[PDB]
Amino acid sequence: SKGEELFTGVVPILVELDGDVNGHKFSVSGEGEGDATYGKLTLKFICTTGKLPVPWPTLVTTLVQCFSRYPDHMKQHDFFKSAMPEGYVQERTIFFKDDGNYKTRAEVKFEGDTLVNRIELKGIDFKEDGNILGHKLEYNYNSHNVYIMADKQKNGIKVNFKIRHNIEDGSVQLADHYQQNTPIGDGPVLLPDNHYLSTQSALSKDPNEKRDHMVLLEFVTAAGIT
Predict the structure, then answer these.
(1) What residues make up the domain containing 192?
(2) Is-contact 88 181, C-beta < 8 A?
(3) What is the 3-state secondary structure of the chain?
(4) In total, how many domains does the chain have?
(5) CATH number at residue 73
């Protein structure tokens, strides 16, 4: 397909987020590369306003599902690439169990050769000494299933999944994700049958970087059809 051809090689990625969580304003800028042939993302994110007021792991899902590997037999179900280059709007509510929530609105599209994710995040009702504002979450990341269904009413998709963030005491901080994507073009998109993405992410630090930052390596594969 048209969208599909844009992802056959390595594509540069830019991520720009503006955030306000319980009145704590911040910005994050990210750069890296995606190679959808292998479901692979490598990015480095910098908090450009100083110290990030939430834990880095809580931003991973917000900070380009077009880089998922769709098996050849599932390629007709790849909404994300089908929307390109004009792109899509991705909206979420993320409910942190026994704590606040993020609401996000992003536009993902090509700007020239570069795949760009521009995001607005608003966080409310957080406890100032909870796991998020209290910075009680481990700097690591678990592997998840991301469930996708068509939303024909909006020529888009609905997505839901549960992120488990490890707490420093050994417990888990659940983050329930509800998501919708809709194309920016008037152009056609692939509306998928039910399926899921299998994800894994590894978080690290650049030992030479003194700014507050996150290095991310991610692999994602579409599944659940045969």
Answers:
(1) 2-226
(2) yes
(3) CHHHHCCCCCEEEEEEEEEEECCEEEEEEEEEEEEHHHCEEEEEEEECCCCCCCCHHHHCCCCCHHHCECCHHHHHHCHHHHCCCCCEEEEEEEEECCCCEEEEEEEEEEECCEEEEEEEEEEECCCCCCCCCCCCECCCCCCCEEEEEEEHHHCEEEEEEEEEEEECCCCEEEEEEEEEEEECCCCCCCCCCCEEEEEEEEEECCCCCCCCEEEEEEEEEEECCC
(4) 1
(5) 2.40.155.10
Resolution for this PDB entry, in angstroms: 1.5
Question: In this structure, what token pair is assigned to residue 70?
Answer: 């769709």
Determination technique for this PDB entry?
X-ray
Task: Write out the two tokens for 210.
Answer: 């003194």
